[PDB]
């Protein structure tokens, strides 16, 4: 289904590589996701970066391979509760969803695509969107990040 | 004070959130004196919280010096200085500095200070020779752009 890698406590000891994504929220809505800077210019040495647009909120994510692969068009969406967004079971915890707007076109039947739901923002299977003939989406979910816990 | 390529997964020991407000050298001490010191990852969303907003944000992967800084974290863009254009230009730079460790105590340790134009890095011994017992930040690491080759 959706690839889910959970951030864990104590992971701050030695990250060799890390990536940065702008942050959008369920309350902020689809508009914020359109507003977020897509191209983050890497003029980096050990990371120095500039963004095409100024953005208030930034999440620092480890260079997990799916997140690293995205590059441009990478965004993180904050959800207060996991259950509403996740088609499957939830742990009643805040959810971070990484989405690639570059692949927003629905081509992957099993692929999950962030879309604007009537209630708010939801992750929808591609096949389901194809059944409703929705050719485009906000972003294609690449990874779901779960919070550190005890 | 290590110099590290931005390279993925060299050491396999755990990966997570760290952030530094960025300054340009051209900006000078004023930008450093104003960048937000406390950058606190929390809640469960883990979106980082800064006591004050900053224009430019860069993160330095949680290598050991970066993790050690905590408060006072800052990143300083440095730009070169070629006599001959054909001679290859030196790469752009970034300095991870602990503003909390402003005081000059280590002769070996480099410390951020202000050049006539822009900022400069000076040895602790040199600063003590010049009678400056204070610096803006203490450099904890050095740069180098990712080289896939």
């Amino acid at each position: 289904r959706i690839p889910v890698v959970r951030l864990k406590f104590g992971e701050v000891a030695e990250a060799t590589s890390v990536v940065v994504l702008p942050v959008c929220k369920a309350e902020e809505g689809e508009k914020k996701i359109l507003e977020a800077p897509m191209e983050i210019i890497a003029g980096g040495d050990f990371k120095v970066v500039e963004a095409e647009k100024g953005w208030k909120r930034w999440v620092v994510l480890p260079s997990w391979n799916p997140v690293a692969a995205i590059g441009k068009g990478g965004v993180a969406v904050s959800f207060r509760d996991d259950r509403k967004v996740l088609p499957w079971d939830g742990k009643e915890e805040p959810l971070l969803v990484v989405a690639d707007r570059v692949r927003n076109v629905v081509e992957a039947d099993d692929g999950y695509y962030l879309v604007v739901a009537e209630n708010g923002l939801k992750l929808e299977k591609g096949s389901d969107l194809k059944a409703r003939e929705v050719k485009e989406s906000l972003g294609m979910v690449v990874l779901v990040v779960r919070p550190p816990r005890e | 004070i290590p110099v590290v390529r931005l390279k993925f997964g060299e050491v396999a020991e755990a990966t997570s959130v760290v952030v530094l407000p960025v300054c340009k050298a051209e900006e000078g001490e004023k930008k450093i004196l104003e960048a937000p010191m406390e950058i606190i990852a929390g809640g469960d969303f883990k979106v980082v919280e800064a006591e004050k907003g900053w224009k430019r944000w860069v993160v330095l992967p949680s290598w050991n010096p970066v993790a050690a800084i905590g408060k006072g974290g800052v990143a300083v863009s440095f730009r070169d200085r070629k006599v001959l254009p054909w001679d290859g230009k030196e790469e752009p730079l970034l300095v991870v500095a602990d503003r909390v460790r402003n005081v000059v105590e280590a002769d070996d340790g480099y410390y951020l200070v202000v050049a006539e134009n822009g900022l400069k890095l000076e040895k602790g011994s040199d600063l003590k020779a010049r009678e400056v017992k204070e610096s803006l930040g203490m450099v904890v690491l050095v740069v180098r752009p990712p080289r896939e080759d």
């Binding site: - | 290590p2 590290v4 390529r5 390279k7 993925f8 060299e10 050491v11 080289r147």
Partner: protein, 418 residues
């Protein structure tokens, strides 16, 4: 508590042991301490508990330090030392669980043992290999191959640049492959690959056998064929057999490689059994020139701890590294550690910096077969060693050190396609 003396200073000839234990509810640490000493030793012949320090953090978890007189041990015998210290002390009701963490062997006892047949410095001289760690690998497919095709695989891997190739620890002699034929074809592979490179190469022929006589026959044949090194499983076969083979090796000039199969049965859990570092010391006394230690990157401090214990002449106690007692080896030669498990060239930087030069790295699937495999590891190691000599930081620059080397070597460039 006639076996517990809160104020006692050990003699230079005493053997010391450090145990960790958890008492049954109702039993004071003091009693458990005394009980361990009593059960393991039974006045001139009794052991004495002299310190019962609690372990920080854990509840109902304590240490016990017990001295044992020199005269309780048979000169030159590991089998006897272990029988006396760990035979039945792990079986009584007062304690829920018991683990042996460390042993201090007094000089007076260390000198009664042979020690490694050759040791680290002699072994380098015999092989004429200096400056760098040694490399090796194993062979896949393991099971079901004919001796001849096996020999070809050995030839290619060694010809390609490895120093050693290792037999599957699980194949001694089986219906699909008999040991005599394997020994002949492997020996041929070595002789040819050696002749074509101008440098000594070996193969860890497995001489593990069901009887002491069969073990010697296998070892003798390896000697007749001119094989520089043989291997044996000291835990499954046991120490009596291992000691015998080590003596044979010294007399005949054959290096001995020790595999640690089944160690997990004894030391995997952290609250019962015998810590590997104890077994490592015991082996250094019994014999063996090379010993599998296992890798770090493919607890770090405790690993480094025993690696020093088996290589250095004198190790100061340091609880943060798992060393409970200062150990003076009385100029007995060390044992060369062998790193393994989950390793390939990407980890080469770390492995070189972690273990230093006095080590062997046993790798492993290369895209272009075995000799390219060997080539890629040979290059990656030399590149790492040289960078370390220059003063480059292998834990940070390791990615670049490998990529520069990869550009130079198509075999390595392929190996790094990860």
């Amino acid at each position: 508590l006639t076996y517990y003396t809160p104020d006692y200073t050990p003699k230079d000839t005493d053997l010391l042991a450090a145990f960790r234990f958890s008492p049954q509810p109702g039993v004071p640490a003091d009693e458990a301490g005394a009980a361990i000493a009593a059960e393991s030793s039974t006045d001139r012949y009794k052991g004495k508990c002299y310190h019962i320090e609690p372990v920080q953090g854990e509840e109902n978890s304590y240490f016990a330090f017990i001295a044992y007189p020199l005269d309780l041990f048979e000169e030159g015998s590991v089998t006897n030392i272990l029988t006396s210290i760990v035979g039945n002390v792990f079986g009584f009701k007062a304690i829920r669980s018991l683990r042996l963490e460390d042993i201090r062997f007094p000089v007076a006892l260390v000198k009664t043992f042979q020690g490694p047949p050759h040791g680290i410095q002699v072994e380098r001289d015999l092989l004429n290999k200096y400056g760098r760690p040694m490399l090796g690998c194993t062979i896949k497919p393991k099971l079901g191959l004919s001796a001849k095709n096996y020999g070809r695989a050995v030839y290619e891997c060694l010809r390609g640049g490895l120093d050693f190739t290792k037999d599957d620890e699980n194949i001694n002699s089986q219906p699909f492959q008999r040991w005599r034929d394997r020994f002949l074809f492997v020996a041929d592979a070595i002789h040819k690959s050696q002749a074509e490179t101008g440098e000594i190469k070996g193969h860890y022929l497995n001489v593990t056998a069901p009887t002491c006589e069969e073990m010697m026959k296998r070892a003798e044949f390896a000697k007749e064929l001119g094989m520089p090194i043989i291997m044996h499983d000291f835990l499954t076969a046991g120490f009596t057999a291992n000691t015998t083979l080590a003596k044979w090796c010294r007399d005949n000039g054959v290096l001995l490689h020790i595999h640690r199969a089944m160690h997990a049965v004894i030391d995997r859990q952290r609250n019962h059994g015998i810590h590997f570092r104890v077994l490592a010391k015991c082996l250094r006394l019994s014999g063996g020139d090379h010993l599998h230690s296992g890798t770090v990157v493919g607890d770090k401090a405790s690993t480094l701890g025993f690696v020093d214990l088996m290589r250095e002449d004198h190790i100061e106690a340091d609880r943060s590294r798992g060393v409970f007692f200062t150990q003076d080896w009385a100029s007995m030669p060390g044992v060369l550690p062998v790193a393994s498990g989950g390793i390939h060239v990407w980890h080469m930087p770390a492995l070189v910096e972690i273990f230093g030069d006095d080590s062997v790295l046993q790798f492993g699937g290369h895209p272009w077969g075995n000799a390219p495999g060997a080539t890629a590891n040979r290059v990656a190691l030399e590149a790492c060693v040289q960078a370390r000599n220059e003063g480059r930081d292998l834990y940070r620059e390791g990615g670049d050190i490998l990529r520069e080397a990869g550009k130079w070597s198509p075999e390595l460039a392929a190996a790094l396609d990860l």
